[PDB]
From a paper:
To investigate the structural basis of [name] inhibition by ebselen, we carried out crystallographic studies. A comparison of our structures with reported [name] complex structures reveals variations in the conformation of the lid depending on the nature of the modification to Cys354. It appears that the hydrophobic residues of the lid (e.g., Tyr308, Met303, Tyr318, Thr320) can adjust to accommodate the group bonded to Cys354, apparently to optimise hydrophobic interactions. These results imply that the lid is conformationally dynamic, with the precise structure observed being related to the nature of modification of the nucleophilic Cys354.
In [name], the cell wall contains high levels of 3 → 3 (meso-Dap–meso-Dap) cross-links (approx. 80% at stationary phase), which are formed by the l,d-transpeptidases (Ldts) (ESI†).6 Evidence has emerged that [name], in particular, plays an important role in the virulence of [name], as disruption of the [name] gene results in altered morphology and inhibition of colony growth. Mechanistically, the Ldts differ from the PBPs through their use of a nucleophilic cysteine rather than serine during catalysis. Several β-lactam antibiotics, in particular carbapenems, have been shown to inhibit the activity of [name] and to have anti-TB activity. Such [name] inhibition involves covalent modification of the nucleophilic cysteine (Cys354), which reacts with β-lactam antibiotics to give (a) stable acyl–enzyme complex(es). Consistent with previous reports, the structure of [name] consists of two N-terminal immunoglobulin fold-related domains and a C-terminal catalytic domain.
Numbering used by the authors: 57 to 407
The structure:
């Protein structure tokens, strides 16, 4: 006749216990007759015992900077055993909150990366990547790449296949993200890839051609950046859209009062770079559209075409610019992810 045995997921006297997982107690050669866990203030922690009496677990989120006391008794035909354990959880120096894009339940285009933006610099990028679980259906290979010290992106080698489900579980609560900075909470999002929409602006023709699943559906005369402030070549991801917006160059590093500065209220504006490129309505340049470049970088189109673009293009669709006198959009722009070669993206930069 064996005495029951108790196995807890913490050890008496432990410090730095992480709260990324529940606390449990298991009985062998007996069943759990009593399990309680209280915090430093005497408040009971919610838990649940399995129907067979063998395993108890906490059922609510456990706190940072706690001292918990666990009491457990097991009974079997061979006798009884009781244990009391006290332990302390992680004490962060700092917290950081993740923000995930795109939005939960959204339908997005074939260029949309998964984005996890933290509100603090992440000292241990590898710990953050490890805590982020990305599910794809149909499953496709992808990889993480950091655009800056706070935001990481995940995407496949090529544009997504329409109809792919994407799930993002950012399981950062209880995780040490370096230098004592712990996740403030978990976050989650799920999204789906819709139709393939790729618009190409060719400086040789000054036409912006929109293709939906490979077919031309719209051909828009455009006026892009003038030679002294050109539109960069490259692949741009569609971001947010606005019925109207005041474009303020100081938002993009350029003082309004300086030679290339501007502040302009425009209609039907679709953002395609963090550096401030938009497709938008430009009634003042309709004469130049299809003929000469006049802007500070934006793709000027007619009011009707800008509204069409707003109505028919969605976040994650693609604009490709070719044959301008500019350089190439930086891969770390914020919407320039696809300009980074796959071998470099795949290798990452977690360090
Ligand atoms: Na993952
Ligand atoms: Na769609």
């Amino acid at each position: 006749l064996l005495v029951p045995k108790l196995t807890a997921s913490v050890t008496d006297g432990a410090v730095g216990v992480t709260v990324d997982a529940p606390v449990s107690v298991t009985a062998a050669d007996g069943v759990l007759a009593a399990v309680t866990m209280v915090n430093d203030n005497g408040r009971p922690v919610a838990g649940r015992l399995s129907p067979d009496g063998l395993r108890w677990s906490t059922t609510e989120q456990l706190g940072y900077n706690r001292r918990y006391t666990l009491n457990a008794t097991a009974l079997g035909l061979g006798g009884a055993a009781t244990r009391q354990l006290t332990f302390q959880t992680s004490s962060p120096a700092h917290l950081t909150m993740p923000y995930v894009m795109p939005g939960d339940g959204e339908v997005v285009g074939v260029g949309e990366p998964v984005a996890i933006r933290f509100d603090e610099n992440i000292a241990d990028r590898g710990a953050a990547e490890k805590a982020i679980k990305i599910t794809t259906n149909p499953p496709v290979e992808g990889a993480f790449y950091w655009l800056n010290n706070r935001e990481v992106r995940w995407r496949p080698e090529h544009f997504w296949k329409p109809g792919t489900a994407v799930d993002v579980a950012v399981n950062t609560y209880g995780v040490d993200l370096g230098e004592g900075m712990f996740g403030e909470d978990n976050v989650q999002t799920h999204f789906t890839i819709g139709d393939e929409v790729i618009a190409t602006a060719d400086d040789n023709t000054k036409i912006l051609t929109v293709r939906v699943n490979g077919e031309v559906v719209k051909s828009m005369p455009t006026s892009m950046g003038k030679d002294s402030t050109p539109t960069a070549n490259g692949i741009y991801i569609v971001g947010s859209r606005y019925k109207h917006i005041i474009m303020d160059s100081s938002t993009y590093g350029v003082p309004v009062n300086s030679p290339n500065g501007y502040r302009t209220d425009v209609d039907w504006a679709t953002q395609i770079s963090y550096s401030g490129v938009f497709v938008h309505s430009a009634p003042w340049s309709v004469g130049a559209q299809g003929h000469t470049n006049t802007s500070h970088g934006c793709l000027n189109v007619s009011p009707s075409n800008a509204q069409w673009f707003y109505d028919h293009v969605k976040r994650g669709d693609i604009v490709e610019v070719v044959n301008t006198v500019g350089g190439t959009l930086p891969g770390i722009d914020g919407l320039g992810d696809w300009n980074i070669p796959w071998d470099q993206w795949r290798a990452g930069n977690a360090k």
